[PDB]
Design a protein around this ligand. Structure first.
Ligand SMILES: CCCCCCCCCCCCCCCCCC(=O)OC[C@H](CO[C@@H]1O[C@H](CO[C@H]2O[C@H](CO)[C@H](O)[C@H](O)[C@H]2O)[C@H](O)[C@H](O)[C@H]1O)OC(=O)CCCCCCCCCCCCCCCCC
Ligand code: CLA
Ligand code: CLA
Ligand code: CLA
Ligand SMILES: CCCCCCCCCCCCCCCCCC(=O)OC[C@H](CO[C@@H]1O[C@H](CO)[C@H](O)[C@H](O)[C@H]1O)OC(=O)CCCCCCCCCCCCCCCCC
Ligand SMILES: CCCCCCCCCCCCCCCCCC(=O)OC[C@H](CO[C@@H]1O[C@H](CO)[C@H](O)[C@H](O)[C@H]1O)OC(=O)CCCCCCCCCCCCCCCCC
Ligand SMILES: CCCCCCCCCCCCCCCCCC(=O)OC[C@H](CO[C@@H]1O[C@H](CO)[C@H](O)[C@H](O)[C@H]1O)OC(=O)CCCCCCCCCCCCCCCCC
Ligand SMILES: CCCCCCCCCCCCCCCCCC(=O)OC[C@H](CO[C@@H]1O[C@H](CO)[C@H](O)[C@H](O)[C@H]1O)OC(=O)CCCCCCCCCCCCCCCCC
Ligand SMILES: CCCCCCCCCCCCCCCC(=O)OC[C@H](COP(=O)(O)OC[C@@H](O)CO)OC(=O)CCCCCCCCCCCCCCC
Ligand SMILES: CC1=C(/C=C/C(C)=C/C=C/C(C)=C/C=C/C=C(C)/C=C/C=C(C)/C=C/C2=C(C)CCCC2(C)C)C(C)(C)CCC1
Ligand SMILES: CC1=C(/C=C/C(C)=C/C=C/C(C)=C/C=C/C=C(C)/C=C/C=C(C)/C=C/C2=C(C)CCCC2(C)C)C(C)(C)CCC1
Ligand code: OEX
Ligand SMILES: [Fe+2]
Lengths: 37, 75, 34, 341, 66, 484, 38, 172, 28, 42, 30, 42
């Protein structure tokens, strides 16, 4: 609700999408590059 | 593919004969157009000292440090 | 196909043009105490 | 089968650089500590924090460039880019000295992520994890100097800046103000570093000089196939050599190579304990029996009291320009000079 | 292998050994707690560091009631 | 055939003697804390708790008894100074003697639990081999620690059934053991709020009660039982150590930076109360309001307590001591007697000169007299030849206000130089250096020593996390690896 | 009592590791004495 | 001076009068002993990692080596595949002879070069001197880290042998 | 593919060397 | 003036741990002479 | 009185160096 | 005022002879465990 508290939760959301776009890209490519049995 | 088989190939040097000078000159123009002094806030040789401020500028506050550097970089 | 020693020659003298350029500007320009 | 198994099989695949699970912590954080240092020594100045020049834009070479510690007014703030000090601006973040904590924090999570890399590869190859335990040595020097030393002090300002000559003043700042060389924890650390360099110079030069003839060529590097079961140097000869030169010698290759692990690493752990004791200013500054005697007897001089007068010169002469935030204005007549210097 | 009277009471607490819940179980419930406890430690550190300012929370030596 | 560094691994496959050993470490820890506190009562002197508190006399474990509510002793003295007729059982001597009696009984129980190692409780009823059900042992032992956390915060701290926490004011003058009502808001995470400590152990005790209710009933998954190796007992030790140095950076952190759980009336002031001038600005503030209420100057400085000026002294900074010098801080310069007063330096022009104060870094510091705007006006010159700012030229006179030098004025250069040197060390005190053979160099407070041990410990236990942790995961290959 | 423990082992220290541990203590005694006497 | 505190009287006075830290031969031997203690503990760990099972878990690890045996006591292919994945493949010595030569090269070359740093600074060919090297366009001296290092050297220079000097320049 | 592995390290390096050669010719 | 508790620190810091390491060697050689069965086992 | 301890530590260190060189456990093949 | 060489007399008069008598007992039990041949001889 302050300047400092509102900016921190926005960084927490921004810290979620940085983990997110790495994770979402990693699941999709792990489907295509599976190893033959 | 082996690494030494890549750089001896011609098709390698076809691509990277354009990309290296187009990227080295962009690193030249990043400096000569005076752009790097404004992104990173580094002083030019003209502007270490000013006419008013003749001492060494320092930050002297925890929380208004952004406002104090708005003071010391206008003049 | 290019011989590999030609590649290390041209890139190797390219580094010398980069390094000796850096020892040039120790005696000219900024940081030269002129 | 499941979703976890496909991700586990993809990361551990044989490829150019082994990624693994630990590469998600190493490769983002190590890339930004290294790139934060190359940017901060090239572009970002120290004109507002220290009142110096520490960039390549400002004429400094490789030696006199650094990523510098922030101001003393910042205190121990983490200096987040979105924080109360920088407030989202990139340019004011760099001028306060925000890249230094950016390098040190993402660097501290690189050394976490690199030591986890050494546990993960050892489990896949199937070996004992002594590389990950010997690398804990250098973790104890990064943490207890770049992190635990400015925390005990007044701010991040008293930390080593990430530059070549900026480490060099930190070596000189720690003698005059702390008497660091007198500390027995450095003395046990020099014994491990000069002792560790000793062991690889001997074991390098004794293996290479008791080699067997495995070929007719004069070059002995050619005569070793890696998958051979015969040992490549005579251990009995090398024992017989040093038992007569030095008097005592290793008779155990398993004990020898373990001893080459213990000696360098312990010198980084014992020296790391002392630098935690200098965050608290618990320094080994004086021998009081030497100091009480030199006060009462103005003729008693040792080499030890000669080092205190060298430290008054470090505490007085550099501290004017060292700490511009405190505004030390010394007169010319208080600075301790010698005779005619 | 010596039956004691206190050993007879506590015996059903040790009688199970190595029974597991088959599958992944309550592992995704745990990670949501661990993601939450990671955010909790970040917040109370930044309160303490004065890098997260909360209104009517001042990190300074306060007058405890005497 | 065990090496000397593996002698205590005979207890790996023996739960019955795992307890007898863990009871013997307990009988030595408890016997230490009893015999340390008996040693401290032979050394403590409750003559003047204002200028000789317990943190000057090097008392280490004694500020941990008075933190949780022990002020009286069987001698009749108290740390609060109020006399008592009877402290009952729980005094300083009662606690010290009860940690000894607890040590003697954990000693005798460890003789039992070592001899009678073969109990049916530790056998597996399905295989017969000695096993410990580590998931349910964790459920029991976490449910107990939920009760002792919630029981502590609700009853000992809040004063429902207990004395409470030592609290204090902002400036270390008044302090007493009192019940503390919890603060549940965001103000609870202010660590200088003592209500946050009560709110913590009440809240987090409930989370520890109902996590033991979880970790009793629900069995581990098949994946996590194999991945974290929960059949092995060393995965308990690998991760218990991680939960122990993590706790030791916190306590060494909040001791060093200060918290409500570390009052400056018990452990001494922090170094950040010298660097920011936390007591210099406060002593002036109680004089700026006194002079504004129509007073003479010497009557304004006489209202200042001797305790408040005693914190404004560089010898009470924990960042001034050394490592291999030993003993209490009273070994430093002697037991303080009285406050000599507040010297005010004025030149022949009449302006006010303040002595520049020594920072915590400098062992030696040149005496410099500075006026209000930062201009160097006087000093004591090293080189006396070309002197331009000496006290003889400037003619600095000293004026005391308050203390035992209340109205006095010294005007000559021999006497002003003696008070200019001792005024850069904070306030000015009269000490007694002949009782303890005080040599003349500063020592450290128990705030400084606690931060030393428990942060050099926590760095060593980080290596134990990597040793015992990598020993758990890699268990099949510690005789060596196979060549195939 | 109960039965004999099957976890009885033996402790070893060869003549080599004696001289390491003796020299370890005396060199730490040489190093840290000067600071303790102060 | 043949002592311990006399060594640090020697090192500090040598710093003020010769500026050894900026001299590139002390730089080439700090790299010799930091590198030397690296490759010591890096080689000593990869042998101890890849030891072959010859003992039990009760006795010592070291007793799986009988003295004078002819069998190799560690899987060298194992430690090559580890370091071949820890950095990358081509940075690993499969040759144990060229590996045990690089352990002898790096420190010894680093201390030959360093000991000819003291030698060339015995004849007053000092290290680098970047004092007052960065100036603005006005010409005022902008400080660097070498200027802060200079003020530490000026403190030791004006205080070493505080009575032996009579003339303004320490020629000796 | 390893084109993202090298060129995350080489595309910056040539860009900074384009700036370090330009700073040799900058004077006051 | 030196601290008189430092004599107790050093001379017990020498003797108590060094006499410990002697004991682990004497019982090592006694077990080796114990198994060997000749003239010294008893 | 103080230097007597330092001398005893030094010559006591040189004793165990003497015994380690000459009374060493001589390693033997087979 | 007490004699400060008496701490060294007593605490070495305790420890040095008492640690001696412990050693003769430990090597006694090691020889008995040495001959016995089971689980502890090595
Ligand atoms: C092992 C393997 C580790 C693996 C590597 C992991 C790396 C992760 C990086 C860790 C991040 C830590 C940095 C956090 C910032 C910091 O610390 O920030 C410091 C802050 C404390 O803030 C400081 O607090 C001080 C106390 O002030 C207080 O007191 C003053 C006088 O009393 C005034 O009253 C002031 O108003 C009041 O706030 C001063 O204010 C300082 O200016 C202010 O910066 O604490 C905090 O955030 C948290 C401190 C409490 C936690 C304690 C643990 C961390 C500290 C360990 C070091 C303890 C010191 C021992 C030295 C050895
Ligand atoms: C919670 C604490 C804890 C516990 C219970 C253990 C338990 C164990 N450790 Mg471990 N360890 C710990 C912390 C702990 N460790 C830490 C912090 C480190 C880092 C230093 C290590 C490093 C370590 C190694 C490197 C090894 C062990 C080993 C062992 C096993 C046998 C111990 C032994 O034979 O020593 C016997 C010790 C002695 C006979 C004498 C030791 C003398 C010490 C060094 C000085 C005297 C101690 C001193 C009085 C203590 C003061 C108290 C202080 C701790 C506050 C055992 C399972 C061994 C193992 O893996 O088992 C196979 C082993 O090789 N540990
Ligand atoms: C009603 C809600 C409530 C309230 C008001 C509190 C109140 C508090 N809690 Mg608590 N807590 C609660 C519920 C609550 N708790 C619940 C439900 C849980 C879950 C069981 C916890 C778990 C918890 C933990 C685990 C901790 C607290 C702490 C605290 C204190 C925070 C202020 C402080 O000094 O932290 C200071 C802030 C920190 C110390 C941040 C920790 C981050 C670490 C130190 C980072 C570094 C780690 C690394 C290994 C160190 C080495 C690196 C080095 C280089 C720096 C305060 C007493 C902290 C405490 O007790 O400290 C005194 C603490 O550590 N709480
Ligand atoms: C019968 C119980 C009992 C009681 C009431 C006391 C009482 C006391 N002891 Mg004592 N003690 C006891 C048993 C007891 N002792 C035993 C059995 C031992 C041997 C282990 C000791 C060893 C001991 C020592 C060594 C010392 C004391 C001290 C003290 C005094 C201050 C306590 C203090 O500050 O601790 C503070 C306690 C803590 C900070 C513990 C924190 C617990 C950590 C943070 C737990 C975190 C992990 C948790 C389990 C995770 C799950 C949380 C979950 C709820 C979510 C106090 C008079 C001190 C003193 O002055 O001695 C005279 C002192 O130094 N005690
Ligand atoms: C394909 C992938 C390639 C991977 C690249 C990986 C990135 C890592 C590269 C690290 C380089 C860090 C060195 C920075 C040096 C710099 O740029 O100086 C560039 C500076 C710039 O030069 C300065 O420019 C200033 C401009 O104002 C002034 O003119 C100064 O006088 C002038 O010296 O040059 C020097 O200081 C001259 C000496 C250079 C000495 C560098 C070698 C020192 C030894 C370091 C070796 C590092 C090994 C790297 C191995 C890879
Ligand atoms: C349920 C879990 C409850 C939490 C666990 C029990 C509390 C243990 C916490 C440690 C004990 C508290 C410290 C000792 C208190 C003390 O000094 O007492 C002393 C106090 C009274 O002490 C009086 O104090 C006076 C003022 O200080 C004077 O000092 C008097 O001399 C002194 O007599 O008595 C109580 O507090 C006793 C209550 C403590 C709890 C009793 C044991 C509870 C055991 C129940 C668990 C068993 C049942 C489980 C079911 C099976
Ligand atoms: C088996 C070995 C048994 C010997 C143990 C050897 C340990 C030696 C080191 C401790 C003794 C050195 C103390 C100096 C001697 C002296 O006279 O002091 C004497 C001082 C006592 O000081 C005396 O006190 C008296 C009244 O108390 C009078 O005031 C005397 O004037 C004053 O000298 O004793 C100590 O300081 C003992 C402290 C021991 C506890 C250490 C606390 C610090 C530990 C931190 C742990 C960190 C470790 C991290 C890991 C590294
Ligand atoms: C293994 C155990 C190792 C410890 C040995 C224990 C022996 C303890 C008894 C001797 C020490 C007691 C001396 C008092 C301590 C003290 O401080 O003294 C200290 C005095 C020295 O006295 C000091 O001297 C200094 C300058 O010399 C200063 O003057 C000091 O002020 C003065 O106190 O030391 C002695 O007197 C040691 C004497 C030991 C030799 C004994 C001579 C008598 C022997 C007669 C033998 C007859 C035996 C017949 C059989 C019975
Ligand atoms: C004129 C020249 C003649 C030669 C001079 C003789 C001096 C030689 C010094 C003897 C070393 C004795 C240490 C015993 C050590 C001991 O006996 O070890 C014996 C050990 C033999 O190990 P093994 O392979 O027999 O062990 C196999 C297993 O049993 C391991 O336990 O040899 C070494 O490893 C020693 C190598 C390092 C040597 C360490 C020397 C450190 C230098 C000395 C530091 C002290 C100096 C202090 C002075 C104040
Ligand atoms: C900071 C930051 C960032 C960024 C990052 C990155 C991305 C970076 C990168 C960067 C990089 C990564 C850099 C690089 C650089 C490089 C360089 C610049 C190099 C150089 C080189 C040299 C100079 C060398 C030399 C040589 C040669 C060439 C050869 C011979 C040898 C020698 C060594 C001499 C971000 C965005 C996140 C944001 C935040 C902050
Ligand atoms: C039997 C019995 C009894 C008795 C008991 C007793 C009397 C107790 C005591 C006990 C004791 C009295 C104990 C003590 C202990 C102590 C300890 C255990 C200590 C130790 C410590 C340590 C070892 C440490 C170390 C160190 C040092 C020294 C220095 C620095 C470092 C360190 C810290 C590491 C009774 C009658 C009650 C009851 C019945 C039975
Ligand atoms: O003698 Mn020994 O140190 Ca070679 O510099 Mn000149 O001389 Mn004396 O002064 Mn500085
Ligand atoms: Fe080797």
């Amino acid at each position: 609700m302050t300047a400092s508290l509102s900016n921190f939760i926005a960084s927490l959301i921004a810290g979620g999408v940085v983990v997110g776009v790495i994770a979402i890209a990693l699941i999709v490519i792990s489907k295509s590059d599976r190893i033959l049995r | 593919r082996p690494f030494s088989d890549i750089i001896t190939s011609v098709r390698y040097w076809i691509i990277h004969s354009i990309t290296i000078p187009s990227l080295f000159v962009s690193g030249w123009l990043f400096i000569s157009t005076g752009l790097a002094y404004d992104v990173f806030g580094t002083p030019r040789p003209n502007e270490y000292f000013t006419q008013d401020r003749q001492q060494v500028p320092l930050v002297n506050d925890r929380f208004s440090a952004k406002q104090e550097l708005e003071d010391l970089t206008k003049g | 196909r290019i011989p590999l020693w030609l590649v290390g020659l041209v890139g190797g003298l390219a580094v010398i043009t980069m390094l000796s350029l850096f020892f040039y500007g120790s005696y000219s320009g900024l940081g030269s105490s002129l | 089968r499941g979703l976890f198994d496909l991700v586990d099989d993809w990361l551990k695949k044989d490829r150019f650089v082994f990624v693994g699970w630990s590469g998600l912590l190493l490769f983002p954080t190590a890339y930004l500590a290294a790139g934060g240092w190359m940017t901060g020594t090239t572009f970002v100045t120290s004109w507002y924090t220290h009142g110096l020049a520490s960039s390549y834009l400002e004429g400094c070479n490789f030696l006199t460039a650094a990523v510098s510690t922030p101001a003393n007014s910042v205190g121990h703030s983490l200096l987040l880019l979105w924080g109360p000090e920088a407030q989202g601006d990139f340019t004011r973040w760099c001028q306060i000295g925000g890249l230094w904590t950016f390098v040190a924090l993402h660097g501290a999570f690189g050394l976490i992520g690199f030591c986890l890399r050494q546990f993960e590869i050892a489990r896949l190859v199937g070996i004992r994890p002594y590389n990950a335990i010997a690398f804990s040595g250098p973790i104890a020097v990064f943490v207890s100097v770049f992190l635990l030393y400015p925390l005990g002090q007044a701010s991040w300002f008293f930390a080593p800046s990430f530059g070549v000559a900026a480490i060099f003043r930190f070596l000189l700042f720690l003698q005059g103000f702390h008497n660091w060389t007198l500390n027995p924890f450095h003395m046990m650390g020099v014994a491990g570093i000069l002792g560790g360099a000793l062991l690889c110079a001997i074991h390098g030069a004794t293996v290479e000089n008791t080699l067997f003839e495995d070929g007719d060529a004069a070059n002995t590097f050619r005569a070793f196939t890696p998958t051979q079961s015969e040992e490549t140097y005579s251990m009995v000869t090398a024992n017989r050599f040093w038992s007569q030169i030095f008097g005592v010698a290793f008779s155990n290759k398993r004990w020898l190579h373990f001893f080459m692990l213990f000696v360098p690493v312990t010198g980084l752990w014992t020296s790391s304990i002392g630098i935690v004791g200098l965050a608290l200013n618990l320094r080994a500054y004086d021998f009081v029996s030497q100091e009480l005697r030199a006060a009462e007897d103005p003729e008693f001089e040792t080499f030890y009291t000669k080092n205190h007068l060298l430290d008054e010169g470090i505490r007085a002469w550099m501290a004017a320009q060292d700490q511009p935030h405190e505004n030390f204005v010394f007169p010319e007549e208080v600075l301790p000079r010698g005779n005619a210097l | 292998a010596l039956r004691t009277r206190l050993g007879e009471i506590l015996r059903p607490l040790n009688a199970e050994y190595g029974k597991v819940a088959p599958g992944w179980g309550t592992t995704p419930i745990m990670g949501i707690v661990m993601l939450a406890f990671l955010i909790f430690l970040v917040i109370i550190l930044q309160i303490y560091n004065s890098s997260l300012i909360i209104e009517n929370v001042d990190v300074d030596w306060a007058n405890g009631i005497v | 055939a065990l090496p000397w560094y593996r002698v205590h691994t005979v207890v790996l496959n023996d739960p019955g003697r795992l307890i007898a050993v863990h009871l013997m470490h307990t009988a030595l820890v408890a016997g230490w804390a009893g015999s340390m506190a008996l040693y401290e009562l032979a050394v403590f002197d409750p003559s003047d708790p204002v200028l000789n508190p317990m943190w000057r006399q090097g008392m280490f474990v004694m500020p941990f008894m008075t933190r949780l509510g022990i002020t009286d002793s069987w001698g009749g003295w108290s740390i609060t100074g109020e006399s008592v007729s009877n402290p009952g059982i729980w005094s300083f001597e009662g606690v010290a003697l009860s940690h000894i009696i607890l040590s003697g009984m954990c000693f005798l129980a460890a003789i039992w639990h070592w001899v009678y190692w073969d109990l049916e409780l530790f056998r597996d009823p399905r295989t017969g081999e000695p096993a410990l059900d580590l998931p349910k042992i964790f459920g029991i032992h976490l449910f107990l620690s939920g009760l002792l956390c919630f029981g502590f915060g609700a009853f000992h701290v809040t004063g429902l059934f207990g004395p409470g926490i030592w609290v204090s004011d902002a400036y270390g003058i008044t302090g007493k053991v009192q019940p503390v009502a919890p603060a549940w808001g965001a103000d609870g995470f202010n660590p200088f709020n003592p209500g946050g400590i009560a709110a913590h152990h009440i809240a987090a005790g409930i989370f520890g009660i109902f996590a033991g209710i979880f970790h009793l009933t629900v069995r581990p998954p098949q994946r996590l039982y194999r991945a974290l190796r929960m059949g092995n007992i060393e995965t308990v030790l690998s991760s218990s150590i991680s939960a122990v140095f993590f706790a030791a950076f916190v306590t060494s952190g909040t001791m060093w930076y200060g918290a409500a759980a570390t009052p400056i009336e018990l452990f001494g002031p922090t170094r950040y109360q010298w660097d920011s001038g936390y007591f210099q600005q406060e002593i002036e503030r109680q004089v700026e309001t006194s002079v504004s209420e129509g007073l003479s100057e010497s009557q304004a400085w006489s209202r200042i307590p001797d305790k408040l000026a005693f914190y404004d002294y560089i010898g009470n900074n924990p960042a001034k001591g050394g490592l291999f010098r030993a003993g209490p801080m009273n070994k430093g310069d002697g037991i303080a007697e009285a406050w000599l007063g507040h010297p005010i330096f004025r030149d022949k022009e009449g302006r006010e000169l303040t002595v520049r104060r020594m920072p915590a870094f400098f062992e030696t510091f040149p005496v410099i007299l500075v006026d209000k705007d930062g201009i160097i006006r006087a000093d004591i010159p090293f080189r006396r030849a070309e002197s331009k700012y000496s006290i003889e030229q400037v003619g600095v006179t000293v004026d005391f206000y308050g203390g035992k030098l209340n109205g006095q004025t010294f005007k000559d250069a021999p006497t002003v130089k003696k008070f200019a040197r001792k005024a850069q060390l904070g306030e000015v005190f009269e000490f007694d250096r002949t009782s303890l053979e005080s040599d003349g160099v500063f020592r450290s407070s128990p705030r400084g020593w606690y931060t030393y041990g428990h942060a050099n410990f926590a760095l060593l236990f980080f290596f134990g996390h990597l040793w015992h942790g990598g020993r758990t995961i890699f268990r099949d290959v510690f005789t060596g690896i196979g060549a195939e | 009592m109960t039965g004999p423990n099957p976890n009885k082992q033996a402790v070893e220290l060869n003549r080599t590791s004696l001289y390491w541990g003796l020299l370890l203590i005396f060199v730490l005694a040489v190093l840290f004495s000067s600071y303790f006497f102060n | 001076p043949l002592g311990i505190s006399g060594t640090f009287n020697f090192m500090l006075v040598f710093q003020a009068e010769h500026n050894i830290l900026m001299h590139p031969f002390h730089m080439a031997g700090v790299a010799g002993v930091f590198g030397g203690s690296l490759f010591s503990a890096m080689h000593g760990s990869l042998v101890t990692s890849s030891l072959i099972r010859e003992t039990t878990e009760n006795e010592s690890t070291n007793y799986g080596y009988k003295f004078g045996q002819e069998e190799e006591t560690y899987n060298i292919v194992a430690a090559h595949g580890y370091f071949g994945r820890l950095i990358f493949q081509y940075a690993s010595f499969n040759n144990s002879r060229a590996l045990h030569f690089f352990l002898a090269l790096w420190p010894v070359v680093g201390i030959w070069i360093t000991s000819m740093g003291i030698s060339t600074m015995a004849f007053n060919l000092n290290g680098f001197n970047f004092n007052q090297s960065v100036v603005d366009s006005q010409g005022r001296v902008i400080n660097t880290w070498a200027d802060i290092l200079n003020r530490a050297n000026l403190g030791i220079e004006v205080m070493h042998e505080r009575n032996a000097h009579n003339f303004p320049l320490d020629l000796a | 593919f390893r084109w993202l592995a090298i060129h995350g390290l080489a595309i910056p390096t040539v860009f900074f060397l384009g700036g370090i050669t330009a700073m040799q010719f900058i004077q006051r | 003036e030196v601290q008189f508790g430092a004599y107790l620190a050093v001379l017990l810091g020498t003797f108590l741990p060094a006499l410990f390491l002697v004991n682990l060697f004497i019982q090592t050689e006694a077990r080796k002479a114990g198994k060997a069965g000749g003239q010294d086992s008893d | 009185m103080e230097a007597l301890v330092y001398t005893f530590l030094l010559i006591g260190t040189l004793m165990v160096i003497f015994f380690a060189v000459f009374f060493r456990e001589t390693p033997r093949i087979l």
